[PDB]
Every structure is written in structure tokens, then in C-alpha cells.
Write a protein that binds this ligand. Structure first.
Ligand SMILES: [Mg+2]
Ligand SMILES: [Mg+2]
Ligand code: NA
Ligand code: NA
Lengths: 429, 426
């Protein structure tokens, strides 16, 4: 408790000097979890990012500097087993690590041999999907996004459907196609409905888009038939990643009535590799937007349940040397919180499991430079985006690399998410 | 080849006499795969149904009478076995069919092994047969889609319905094995008289009579499965009840599809009937008009003749009422077409994935696959042949899906897919 609070102290610094870079994502205050391997050891194992390096948790446990309840949960291809140990475990590990990485601590700092083994450069590492995802659910909880999208489908006056302000609507996504940052994404072929022709055609998607989102990861499940209350919801959440829900919008338009988006979504979803713990995000909790009408009782919660997470997306054409930023927004603008989303997810009795992934829905902000999709940013191509380094984009083109990035900004430091990147491959011919 | 064809011969019979029952599901021609434990060994392991008994595959492998490429038969799920591929499935099938044949004494007369390796179903507990990585549900009955659509339009079918096998991602986590009771969901309801929705018990709880097919070989992300290769990716089939809360669905589902109204429970039968065992019952699928795009086309026959029936029994009622009888052969889109369309944009599939057919409604009014259709949204409640009436499912009701392939004096059947409805939380 008091130990947990010390790990959030902005004044703390690490003897890993790169960790003290004021704009770096991996401050000693962060300590996110991932799954890595390296050139010396291709076995996947649990790692914690610090500065430009990674702490090998299995190595620290073997040396006796790190203990979890008693096979090692740190020698695993996924974080599931360690997450399943519960929140007391996550915090114990976080406090031990924070102590050991602290500049005033000598236990690991001054052990050159163990430090030469237990700390690995990210430049030497392979980062893998951090969890084995039992289920992936995606919501739609940005009022600005639903307004922007709905305005094109109807008009500003009728942008929002009545159920949208009564529930955090969502759908099951495809867990199998969630891939880690860096995985190339192939432009899908599919059925396209052209405005001139009576019957659909088969061809390459012409409206390939991102969806800027976050995903939170379930740390404690719930039994089938047993809802999670809104007040209890956040205690079930382990942490967060960045999430790009790649969308083929022309494929979506033709297939989606009435059972929802399907092939247009499931060809690829990318997440960042580092799970930033919900505890690490506590210093950035802020007041969520005001809801009108007041939702039904089961969706209500007192206090603050939004999080101040700066988000950015860059797009780099294949021939470009530098990427151009195409949007900047914040997770704090979402109309429905994670607590409310999970509460609604389970209100009818659906169960959840450790490692489940819950996408926020496209995060769109107040200003025209803060929308979370090219569909919004270019208003369906009516005003193509002029790229800072050169070129124009309506939707994504072949060889474009799309990079999501995110951080919480504190006083003199950051708690950041790394990157969620993918580069588009030409459709199959 | 010759070896496999001998396992389909309707003339073959077992020394497990109950398997020779003409109306039994677990003939020697079936040999479906499941996961069981029993009173003597609580460890979950791979079993094959024969008559009223279960062949303990791990016990035979230990006894030397069974071989495959820790044993894949000592698992809580069929996934690792299925992952060995179709040669291994057929190998096991041929070996078991021989060992269970009326005249083979290798297993029949080894009493110390047979006492351990043949377990009565009555002394055994059956579990969910696979660890499901993904669950997809389709919508491929023209009769079903017509009846549903006919409730909002005259143009009952939308255009895209006849051009693709539309489907949606389901919730893998709430797929439960037959016999698991299902709690009626609470959710948001849109009442006709009130502007804002209310929270309360679901009032239109329904079944959806389906089958599910289980993937036996996946495909890489970005690499579609062609329609002509689709069936070689399919291990087997189960019965599937996609429980549905229709008033919850109507309010939530635009535009992202059904969600809370479906994910509270989906029941499957425990015995996976292999596609090989189903081969004698392959039949011609319905004629499609218009002709689909080329990637959805296949020559030959790709439907399967599967009798399906659903009973409803009120709580403490002695006799169940059969409320519908249909057949899988009526589905407009085949399993091959569903899998082709599922992957055509590059979605990947994994061993153990579950693919529901959608509600199976036939042409006649007594073959519809949901109470929504059988009662026309409650406008004509149905009279339980044993007494009482139903619009939608009431608390305590037990809904049982059953099914079999009818051969000449024998059956290749699926067992049952049952659940009793528990009251909603209060
Ligand atoms: Mg999305
Ligand atoms: Mg269904
Ligand atoms: Na996607
Ligand atoms: Na269901």
C-alpha cells in the first residue's frame, strides 16, 4: 500500500540511465510487462521494460532477487499464468522491481555479472504478443467517433442512434488475428458493392483504414452467469496496450447488416507488446466526460474513471524517409469507461477470462486533428490528408506503415506504451 | 483407403452388443471422439463412444493396441490429438473399428485390459470436447432468414444474404457442454410504451437449433482457404444450441450485431462425430440462385443428411414435447462455403475452432429452428403435445437437441445437446 505508493513517486529515478530520459516511455514509474526472447536465449520469458532495456524477470527470480507464490511463471510464452496470480502478485513484483531499479539501491545495480545477464537491450530483443487472448471484444465508446461516422451515414442531427447513449455497444472480435506490433498486414480481398453494378464484385479492398484504440487486458475473470458490477470492474483489469483495429470499410459496408462487421475486421488487429499496468496508470486517472442521459443504474459509478493518455498516429509512405503525424488525441475523451464496458459486457451473464482483450473503440477527440481514423480525418475522402513530409492520403495505400504511440505525461517524466506498428502488403493477386 | 472404406460398411457389427441397436447413436460405423473422466479415474482423457460404453484410448495405447505419431490421449481436450491431422484420425478410426469388430478377440478377450479400457457411459462424465480458440456463428438457412426477415419486410431477404454466408464472431468462453444449466439473462429491454430502456429479466428467451463444425487444420493469417479445399480442414460436427435473448438482441444489435443476447450461453453436444463417419450421408445441397461469386462455388455434393429434433419439457413434467423436426441438408450455404468465406479476406483459423451453421429451419412449419418462428413471435403460441403452451422458454424448461444420420437399419448419431433454464438473478 505505502510500498505501492512509493513506486508512483515522480521523484524516483533509476540507475538505468536511459530510464531517466524525460520523454522516454519506460520510466522507473512505468514497469510494463511483456514477453521477450533474445539472441542468446530464444526461449520466451517475462520481461519488464526499463529505459531502452528489458529486465529478465526469470533471471532475477533464479538469482533470488524476485519471488512470486510457488515451474516458473516467468518462463512462459504468455503473461497469462503470472497475471492469474492476482493483483497482490502484480503489486509485490512491481514493488520489488521498483526497489531494485532505484538509483539508491545497490543489490542489482552493483552486481555486474547478474546485471550483465538480467538486463537486455531492447535493440537485441524480440517482443512477442504479451498474452494468449482467450477472447477479444471491441467496443465503440467514443461519442465524437460515433458522431462523425453517424453524420456520414445519416446527418449531424441524427448522428447518434438512441441505444448508443444507453449502453456501451460492442461486438465480439476475432482473437486469432490479434498480432503483435511489427507484423505486416496484407490488404484483404473480399466482396465489394460498387454503386453502379447490381451484384457485388470480388476484389482488393479500396478503403483500408486504421482504428486508433486502446485495449485493456483482463486480470481476473468472472464466472458464467455472474455479472461484474461497475464498482467492482476495474479490480478485474490488469493493464492496457495500444490497439489498431484494421478495418476494410468497403468490405464492411456490404457485409455488416444485420450481424455486424466480420471479414472487414478479422483480417488483422495489432497491439503494442508492453502491457502498462493499471496501477502504473493510477497517477493519470481523471474525470470522465459527463453522460446525458444518466445511464441505467447498473452502469453508474461515482468518482473518476478516465485516464489521461496522450495518443498519436503517424503514417509513413513507402518512399518516405520520415513519418508524418496524422492525428493526436487522448483516451480521456471516451464517453464510456472501461469499468462501464466490462459491467455491460457481463451484465447478461457472459464470463471473462485472464488475458481477454477489450478494445475501447476508435478514440476520436474534439478537434479535426484528433480523430482516430482516416475515415474521419479525411471525411470519407472529401478532404484528403496532406502529409507533413509530402503526399496526400484518403485511405491507407500499399507500403504505408501506420504507427500508434501513446504516453501519460507527468511532471518531468512519462508513463508510455511504446508503439503499435504495421506496414501494409499488397493484396494477393 | 480400402482400410477406411471398411469402417463405413453398414454390415459391420461390434461385440459391444449395445452398439448394434438399430436406433442407437453409437454404432460401430460412428466412433465419435470425446473427453471423459469416470469414477475410477478422475483424470480427463480421450474417449470414443461405442454403444453404451467408451473406449479409453490411452489405456489401449498403453496396452500396445493403439498407436499414433506424454500421450495425446491424456489431455483435457481433443485439440492435441486433432492437431495430428487426418491421417492420424483415420489410423485411429481403422484400428478402433477393427478392435471393436465382432470377430476380433485382441481386446474382446483381454479381460484385465477390457475391464480398464471399456467404460460404461453410465459410470463416466463427459466434458467439453475441445478447447475452443474461436467460435463463429453463421446464418445460412434461407427458411430461417426468410421467416425472421418476414417480420420486418414483405423483400424478406436482404441482398447480401444470397451473395455471401453472412456470419459473426461468437463468444468462445460461454460455450458449455450438454447438461449445463443456463441462467436466464438480465439485460436492457426496450418496451413499446416507454421512451428509455429498462433493466430486467429477459422476456423472449429462445433456442437456435444449429450444428457446429470443428476445425481440424487451420490456415495462416492472410492465406484464404479455397472452397474446394475447405472440407479437408474440418475434423467433425456437434449439435449446437445458440441460446438467444431476443428482446435484449433487438435493442442492442444495431449496428454491430448481436452481443449480450448471445454470449450468455451456447451449448454443444459432447461427442464430435467425424466428417469421415458422416461421408455415407453426403447429399446434394439446395440449388443456389443467383450463382455465387467464383470463390464460393464448388462442384459435387456438400450437404449432409442429418435428422434433427428438439424437445421441450416443463420442469417437473413427466414427458417432453417434440417441438420441431428438421434436417441439416436444407441449409443454403454449406460448411465448405462458410469456411471459404470466413477466410477469404485473410482471417486465420485454428484447431478446435467452432463454426455454427445458424438456425436450421426447414420448409414445413413444423421444422423451424426457433420458438420465434414456431410461434411467430408469440402470435400463435404452441401447444405442448403433453399439455401447456409456450411462446418463449419459461423458467425450469429443459430444451434438448438430438440428431442422427439414418442409414439402413443403423444410425450414426450425435447424442444430445440439452440445458435447463435457471431463473434470472434477482
Ligand atoms: Mg474498432
Ligand atoms: Mg445463432
Ligand atoms: Na481489425
Ligand atoms: Na448463445
Amino acid at each position: 500500500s505505502s510500498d505501492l505508493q512509493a513506486t508512483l513517486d515522480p521523484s524516483r529515478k533509476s540507475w538505468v540511465e536511459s530510464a531517466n530520459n524525460p520523454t522516454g516511455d519506460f520510466s522507473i514509474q512505468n514497469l510494463p510487462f511483456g514477453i521477450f526472447s533474445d539472441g542468446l536465449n530464444a526461449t520466451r520469458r517475462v520481461g519488464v521494460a526499463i529505459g531502452d532495456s528489458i529486465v529478465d524477470l526469470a533471471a532475477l527470480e533464479s538469482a533470488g532477487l524476485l519471488s512470486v507464490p510457488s515451474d516458473s511463471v516467468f518462463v512462459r510464452d504468455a503473461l497469462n499464468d503470472f497475471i492469474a496470480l492476482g493483483r497482490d502478485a502484480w503489486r509485490s513484483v512491481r514493488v520489488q522491481l521498483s526497489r531494485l531499479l532505484s538509483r539508491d539501491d545497490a543489490t542489482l545495480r552493483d552486481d555486474a555479472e547478474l546485471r550483465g545477464r538480467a538486463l537486455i537491450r531492447q535493440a537485441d530483443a524480440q517482443l512477442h504478443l504479451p498474452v494468449q487472448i482467450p477472447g477479444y471484444t471491441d467496443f465503440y465508446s467514443s461519442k465524437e467517433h460515433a458522431t462523425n461516422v453517424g453524420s456520414m451515414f445519416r446527418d449531424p442531427k441524427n448522428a447518434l442512434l438512441p441505444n448508443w447513449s444507453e449502453m456501451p455497444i460492442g461486438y465480439n472480435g476475432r482473437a486469432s488475428s490479434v498480432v503483435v506490433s511489427g507484423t505486416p498486414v496484407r490488404r484483404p480481398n473480399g466482396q465489394l458493392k460498387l454503386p453502379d453494378q447490381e451484384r457485388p464484385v470480388f476484389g482488393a479492398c479500396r478503403k483500408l483504414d486504421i482504428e486508433l484504440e486502446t485495449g485493456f487486458v483482463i486480470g481476473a475473470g468472472n464466472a458464467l452467469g455472474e455479472p461484474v458490477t461497475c464498482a467492482d470492474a476495474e479490480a478485474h483489469i490488469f493493464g492496457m496496450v495500444l490497439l489498431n483495429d484494421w478495418s476494410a470499410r468497403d468490405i464492411q459496408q456490404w457485409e455488416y447488416v444485420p450481424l455486424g462487421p466480420f471479414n472487414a475486421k478479422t483480417f488483422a488487429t495489432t497491439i503494442s507488446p508492453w502491457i502498462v499496468t493499471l496501477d502504473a496508470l493510477e497517477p493519470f486517472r481523471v474525470a470522465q466526460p459527463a453522460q446525458d442521459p444518466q445511464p441505467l443504474a447498473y452502469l453508474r459509478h461515482d468518482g473518476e474513471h478516465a485516464f489521461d493518455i496522450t495518443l498519436e498516429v503517424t503514417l509513413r509512405p513507402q518512399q518516405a524517409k520520415e513519418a508524418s503525424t496524422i492525428t493526436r488525441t487522448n483516451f480521456k475523451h471516451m464517453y464510456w469507461t472501461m469499468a462501464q464496458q466490462l459491467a455491460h459486457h457481463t451484465v447478461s451473464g457472459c464470463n471473462t477470462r485472464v488475458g481477454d482483450l477489450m478494445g475501447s473503440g476508435t478514440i476520436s477527440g474534439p478537434t479535426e486533428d484528433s480523430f482516430g481514423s482516416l475515415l474521419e480525418l479525411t471525411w470519407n475522402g472529401k478532404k484528403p490528408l496532406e502529409l507533413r513530409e509530402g503526399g496526400t492520403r484518403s485511405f491507407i495505400e500499399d507500403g504505408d506503415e501506420l504507427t500508434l504511440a501513446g504516453w501519460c505525461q507527468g511532471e518531468g517524466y512519462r508513463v508510455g506504451f511504446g508503439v503499435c506498428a504495421g506496414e501494409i502488403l499488397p493484396a494477393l493477386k
